């Protein structure tokens, strides 16, 4: 119902934070730094939560609403997946190659949802 939208400045600024943290996650995947995934995921989650808060809850333009849940949904999945690097009992096996792909996939989804939001927001802010 609320079509108020954040500042373009603000979105970009928050977008840059998300992108920086996900980049750090990517490098750690490339580096097989699996013990970095949980702290990276925390930083991404924070960054996501702040960007989603630039918009009113139940905002108005449908594509803003579609993008936000996908942004929020994906941040939630990334955190969950990342915790799985920590096995059930100590010295339990972990399929790190599969998990890492699941992790990166989730990160893709975040970047995707963020760009969607950037695109709609920068756009609506002209006419």
């Amino acid at each position: 119902l609320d079509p108020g939208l954040p500042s373009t400045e603000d979105v970009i600024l928050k977008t840059e934070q998300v992108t920086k943290n996900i980049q750090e996650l990517l490098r750690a995947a490339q580096e097989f730094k699996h013990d970095s995934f949980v702290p990276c995921s925390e930083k991404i989650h924070l960054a996501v939560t702040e960007m989603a808060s630039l918009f009113p809850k139940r905002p108005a333009l449908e594509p803003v609403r579609s993008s936000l849940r996908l942004l929020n949904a994906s941040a939630y999945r990334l955190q969950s997946e990342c915790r799985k690097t920590v096995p059930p009992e100590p010295g339990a096996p972990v399929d790190f190659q599969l998990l890492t792909q699941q992790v990166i996939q989730c990160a893709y989804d975040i970047a995707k949802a963020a760009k969607q939001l950037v695109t709609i927001t920068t756009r609506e802010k002209k006419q």
Binding site: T15, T19, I104
Partner: peptide, 21 residues
């Protein structure tokens, strides 16, 4: 926001390439 999106597209290309090697 173009550069915002370009930086996002840059990151998405990198992530999906990691998924395609």
């Amino acid at each position: 926001g173009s550069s915002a999106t370009r930086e996002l597209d840059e990151l998405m290309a990198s992530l999906s390439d990691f998924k395609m090697q």
